[PDB]
């Protein structure tokens, strides 16, 4: 098994910027058997560069690939919005045919703090004997963020479900939602519910809380 390592796994770059990502094999392969694939969300992987340096049909000229042996690289002279995607290198040299972990290329932009919002359970939901507290952390950058739930100053990690959206197609920001699910009971036996989040954008953890009623 020839292992392909791609680096970095995630990278950001502003438009017009030159971009280079690498792919190194654990053992040498024919430059002719190393290919790159582009994949955008929801779509199927597409052959981008074949045989190390040949552009596939319909691939922009700002793309180029280099290498031989165990080291390869894909370069974008001037990055455009439509370039944001995930790139996979693949070796069709010796089976089992392998794929690199891919490099996710995202659009870089000015840092932006998240606008938090905590939401208490629903009457309707409470009626069913369940209670879910939801916290929204919208439009921020970078994606790195750490949310914590505090029930009466106490940290709670049981029953939390987070979800992130992809880089916004318009403002290139990220969003996340975190839901803490408890019972009508164990929820009605606590007063303060806190949604805490630390973002590069701040050394002072952002907090949004509420008391029952």
């Amino acid at each position: 098994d020839i292992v392909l390592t791609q680096s970095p796994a995630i990278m950001s770059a502003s438009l017009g910027e030159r971009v280079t990502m690498t792919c190194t094999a654990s053992s040498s392969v024919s430059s002719s058997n190393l290919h790159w694939y582009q994949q955008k969300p929801g779509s199927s992987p597409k052959l981008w560069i074949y045989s190390t340096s040949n552009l596939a049909s319909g691939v922009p000229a700002r793309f180029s690939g280099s290498g031989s042996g165990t080291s390869y690289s894909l370069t974008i002279s001037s990055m455009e919005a439509e370039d944001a995607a995930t790139y996979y290198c693949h070796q069709y040299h010796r089976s089992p045919y392998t794929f690199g972990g891919g490099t996710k290329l995202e659009i870089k932009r000015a840092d932006a703090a998240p606008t938090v919002s905590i939401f208490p359970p629903s009457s309707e939901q409470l009626t069913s004997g369940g209670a879910s507290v939801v916290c929204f952390l919208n439009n921020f950058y970078p994606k790195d963020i750490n949310v914590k739930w505090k029930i009466d100053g106490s940290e709670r990690q049981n029953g939390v479900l987070n979800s992130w959206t992809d880089q916004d197609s318009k403002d290139s920001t990220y969003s996340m939602s975190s839901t803490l699910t408890l019972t009508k009971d164990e929820y009605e036996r606590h007063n303060s519910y806190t949604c805490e989040a630390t973002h590069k954008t701040s050394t002072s953890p952002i907090v949004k809380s509420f008391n029952r009623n």
Partner: protein, 217 residues
């Protein structure tokens, strides 16, 4: 002219088996190598097996050996992938790919086929409105939300005011919680329009042919 069409999305119960198909158009599969690739959700691509439709010779990746069986019917110009003793780890998208005789031109990959393994039954979503507990979340403007819990299978459609509200909307990807899906959609609107004008979130679950509307107070 070259194109690979794959069979439709599949929903199967654990323990069962399924047989996916990949029909090639614009070219004979006898003159090439057919491949099946699997991609787990948010994971990477994994090559599974290859076959020479000319002699039936097959190559497998050890970890799939036993579980997967690749076959091909050159007469119908079709390649199949059979998966047995299904489990949730088999849930993923499956692509069939043709090793081109000429790389330069053509997209030799298939659209992919989604395979979901669940023992869950179609379940309509429980929609719960999310209103702000009275607190200045952000200067003036405000943010509302809707919680879509315990539904199956994916997907659901979350619109605000039937469509009149498609600005500042954030619908988060569904996430599995006890075999059912849960999702949430937030909506941002200038402090001047709420609670002034009424805001409703419309959820639709095709599989269950249900459409709910929830107003926020």
């Amino acid at each position: 002219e070259v194109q690979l069409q794959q069979s439709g999305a599949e929903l199967v119960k654990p323990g069962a088996s399924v047989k996916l198909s990949c029909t090639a158009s614009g070219f004979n599969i006898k003159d090439t190598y057919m491949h099946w690739v699997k991609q787990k959700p948010e994971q990477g691509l994994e090559w599974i097996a290859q076959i020479d439709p000319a002699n039936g010779n097959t190559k497998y990746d050890p970890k799939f050996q036993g579980k997967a069986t690749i076959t091909a019917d050159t007469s119908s110009n079709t390649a199949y992938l059979h998966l047995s003793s299904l489990t949730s780890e088999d849930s993923a998208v499956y692509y069939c790919a043709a090793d081109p005789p000429y790389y330069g031109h053509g997209d030799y990959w298939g659209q992919g086929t989604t395979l979901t393994v669940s023992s869950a039954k179609t379940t309509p979503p429980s929609v719960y409105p999310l209103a702000p507990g009275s607190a200045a979340q952000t200067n003036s403007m405000v943010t509302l939300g809707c919680l879509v819990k315990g539904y199956f299978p994916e997907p659901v459609t979350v619109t605000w005011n039937s469509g009149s509200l498609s600005s500042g909307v954030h619908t988060f990807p569904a996430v599995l919680q006890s075999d059912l899906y849960t999702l949430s959609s937030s909506v941002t609107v200038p402090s001047s329009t709420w609670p002034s004008e009424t805001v409703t979130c419309n959820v639709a679950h095709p599989a269950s042919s249900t459409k709910v509307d929830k107003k926020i107070v």
